[PDB]
Amino acid sequence: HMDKEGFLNKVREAVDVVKLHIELGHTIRIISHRDADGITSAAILAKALGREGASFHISIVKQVSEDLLRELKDEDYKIFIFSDLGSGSLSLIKEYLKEKTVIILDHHPPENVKLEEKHILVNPVQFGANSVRDLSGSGVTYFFARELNEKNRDLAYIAIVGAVGDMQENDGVFHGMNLDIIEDGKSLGILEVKKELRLFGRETRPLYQMLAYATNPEIPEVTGDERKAIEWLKNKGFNPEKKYWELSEEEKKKLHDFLIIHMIKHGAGKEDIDRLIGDVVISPLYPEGDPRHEAREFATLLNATGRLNLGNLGVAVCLGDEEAFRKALKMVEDYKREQIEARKWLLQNWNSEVWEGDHVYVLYVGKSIRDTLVGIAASMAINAGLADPEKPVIVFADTDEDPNLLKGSARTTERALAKGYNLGEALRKAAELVNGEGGGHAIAAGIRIPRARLAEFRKLIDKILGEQVS
Template sequence: MVLKGLSEACERILGLDKSSSVLCVSHDDADGLTAGAIIYRALLREGLTPHLRCIKRLDLEFIQGVSAEEWSIFIFSDTGSGQLENFDKHILEDRQVIILDHHETTDYTHPNLTHVNPHLNGVDGAREVSGAGVSYLFARELNPDNRNLAHLALIGALGDVQDSQGGFSGHNKEIARDAVDAGLVLIEKDLRFFGRQTRPLYKAIEYTTEPFIPSLSGNESACVQFLSDLDIPAKKNDRPTRLIDLTDDEKKKLTTALILKMIEHKIDVKTAESIVGDTYTILSEKEGTILRDAKEYTSLLNACGRYEKYGVGVGICLGDRGDALDSAMSLLEEHKRYISSCYEWINKNLDSLVDAGEVYSIHAHGELSDTVVGTVASMIVNSQILNPVKPVIAFADSDDEVKVSGRATKELVDKGVNLGHAMLYAAEKTGSEGGGHDIAAGAQVPHGREDEFVKHINEKVREQLHGSG
């Protein structure tokens, strides 16, 4: 299925004078950075000179700011679908806008707007295509030579965890074929660890949260002992053993033991077996380096985004393997330490988890950065510590507002939960902004209105699960 609006978006670009001023705006996570890099490279190929800005959040203030600048056309990737009304008020009267997004939205038309979004085609933007994927499909439609950017779209999709069921589906699967056919990516079945190429094996297990491995995820010493009990050597070739260093027999033994451990802890067989699935090797990168494995690539980009070093992340996507990569590696080490502290914070603050009825809520206040509150919500909802399992709504202070992130599981979504709709509903009730996907969503809430926000989230999730009656 060709997404509605792709041809029209291409016509807008091909109709531009080469001297046209083009502002590209993208989100600041791995999906957004890869989306921005794809658009930037594709426009350069057409002889244009685009400018790229990556942002934490697209809001009215940002839109008003750029509307006062002299741009011929605006392109929003991995963002924009939730701001149609503000575009109408501040930009569309005299300038063109192209939106290439995958978050839930409404259909809206304007002569100066081209809105490409999978949800407008009945395609699931939470699982079947990411922001980078939509951007790639546009770039490929614009010029077939842009197939050489397919690997970036896969990295973006992995950043949004769109492979959570062990592989890709929908448009992501189509993009994966492009990447394989172009000789960019090798896809093979393996343990879906972060750090296959670079991390010591015990650290790769420790940092695995999807699926969460009871007694191992977040527990370094337990992971070391687990591998010792399996007679898997701690070192090979005078360095800590990595996943890529294991023999086939060692890998089979490890896989079986991990699945059995999860099943012993009451995790369903399908979820336990999802620890094995498609893995993605970037063939142009050196073996044993962090960029060789697509999932590790996403972790590097997320670190760049979370520390607001957007140019570093985009530079890596565009091929900088010098200063940008060095900077990103330093950011990643800092980010790893911070994520480890998040595990510790969760363990120390489980008593602060509030059962609000249909959801759980937890508030980090100023103890954690707002840039990791979504990660914290994911860790909790996937940890198997919740009984029963419900969506998790996490809060953290963010300047003059409170950042909110909600996470659910695939099983909850299958039962009817849609956190994107629930966040939008609660945001409207509290005079704030929010939205996202069914399984992951976010908002910004005024200080002091967190309890009210949770109340409205609870109302909407109850309605989704049990009906309005």
């Protein structure tokens, strides 16, 4: 449970100080995250401020680094808006942006420091929200836009695209104020919530690829084998080359039955079965078979643009630019190819490269897996059975822009959270002793450390994770 009225009041506070700069004609400096949640957040801001005639300059970056801020203070603008980032760096924000106004529309757990009055923090977790379940970066941006203007309710589907991108329904259903965003889109007719297969490929992928690409959760003896998916689908009575949206409601229900019975016969956990069929958000504003018709395929299209340093193009895709959509459509196939090869490399090199301690797996891939896929790689290590569900997994890779730095993402399960693990506070406390930058949610966190201190990090992160148990 969260205080929705208290958080809404803090939203009204940020809206009031933003209208302060809109009246004077100030250009809003928008810094957003490269993830699909961040791309949607920048698109919601661009449309909301556009309805007010305000000027804005959007930059889609990977993280709020120390190097970003000292280049950002000497810019030109008088107000800055951080969407889907900034909560784990407001200590550095009130130092480098002390002489500027800063708005932070983020949902990450924020480090507890006192903020300057010209820096308004709008974070739902300060009002009782779950960091990975109640609201995402696009959700904070949506409520910020909806308070600035009620007409911004037509951005409810774009906000849900970001929530599915951040996997805010990973347990199979939506929670928190995401349901309030859904009810806004339902009253406008731009959004429908079905109970379908929560797998990528509802619109553009054949049914056998949808089953073979399933990594969250995995379908036993079918994930990674398109041939066995073709055969299993056929002797159950389904055309493998048909699309899931081309299935009738009778075929979908029958498909769900065979899939659940399959997971049960092969010993899949109840939690994976419960999250296989759940909330799937569609939008009648788009044709069926188009990836924008479903939220997960929309977010995958947005992640394909941010993967190639083209997040601004994905922002135009959300806004309705059809030429940017045709260019974005040519980026997803290689994005899915690199995910499959990340899982291929994972299954082959796990038992020979992983560093297993008393409370963590630490896998260093070097350059075999790109730095923006270590989060997906850490989750794939858990869903493939390579790692114990109660022991977190951290995957490191060489940073794209600097070889002397390592990008790491930590993922774990809800069962390990019941034991006392807090990946966000563990990586934040570890990064302090490594000259690095850490932080994130209790179930998912990211860290950037120098490559030289890797062996020391493995020892410290295992001790730190061992302290927060009990």
